Amino acid sequence: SEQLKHCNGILKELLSKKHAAYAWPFYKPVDASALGVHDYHDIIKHPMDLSTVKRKMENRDYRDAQEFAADVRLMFSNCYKYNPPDHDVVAMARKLQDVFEFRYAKMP
Ligand SMILES: CC[C@@H](C(=O)OC)[C@@H]1N=C(c2ccc(Cl)cc2)c2cc(OC)ccc2-n2c(C)nnc21
């Protein structure tokens, strides 16, 4: 699909070395305990990350571009939900989200 093809194109860019300085926290699912937090899944009922998005895209589980956008945004939303507005990871999330939001808008 031309939209989903566009989305796959966005996913690839989000995973580029190009944005690796602020994207790396979003490459894989949050491992709370490992990071020293034990309340993350109390707060966050629906974890999401880029590898899972890439998985679903490979299984063609996305009915359209909107479902894709919803997951990517959920990933960012989870990060802003759990963390304080001044946290570094949050700043990393806004930088990557600006790449996503800008490419998503340029879709046919
Ligand atoms: C687990 C909650 C939060 C935290 O306090 O981590 C110690 C965490 N911080 C971080 C975090 C904290 C500070 C910086 Cl500068 C970057 C990432 C984090 C780190 C990772 O390493 C593989 C993966 C995920 C996160 N992450 C995401 C995404 N959303 N919130 C976080």
Side-chain angles (χ1 to χ4, degrees):
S1 167
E2 288 315 296
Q3 280 190 338
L4 287 161
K5 194 195 295 182
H6 190 81
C7 293
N8 219 312
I10 299 166
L11 184 52
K12 311 297 179 53
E13 166 154 24
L14 293 187
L15 289 156
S16 294
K17 270 121 56 190
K18 179 177 273 293
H19 312 288
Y22 40 86
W24 62 263
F26 306 97
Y27 288 164
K28 301 287 169 185
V30 171
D31 189 346
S33 65
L35 296 163
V37 308
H38 313 270
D39 63 350
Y40 180 79
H41 298 277
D42 296 0
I43 319 289
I44 305 294
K45 294 312 159 184
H46 295 102
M48 183 55 57
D49 64 275
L50 287 181
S51 83
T52 301
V53 158
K54 187 169 204 67
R55 190 198 77 237
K56 289 186 38 189
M57 182 79 77
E58 283 167 8
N59 300 12
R60 314 291 161 193
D61 298 356
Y62 286 123
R63 276 139 290 248
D64 51 51
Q66 301 92 290
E67 302 195 346
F68 166 83
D71 270 6
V72 172
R73 287 169 169 162
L74 169 59
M75 177 182 82
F76 292 126
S77 289
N78 287 341
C79 188
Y80 313 134
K81 178 160 181 139
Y82 181 89
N83 297 115
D86 54 315
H87 204 289
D88 283 345
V89 73
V90 163
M92 292 187 179
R94 289 153 169 182
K95 305 184 199 305
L96 189 65
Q97 180 160 30
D98 286 335
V99 178
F100 168 76
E101 294 295 343
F102 199 80
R103 297 293 185 246
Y104 187 68
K106 300 297 192 171
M107 187 186 51

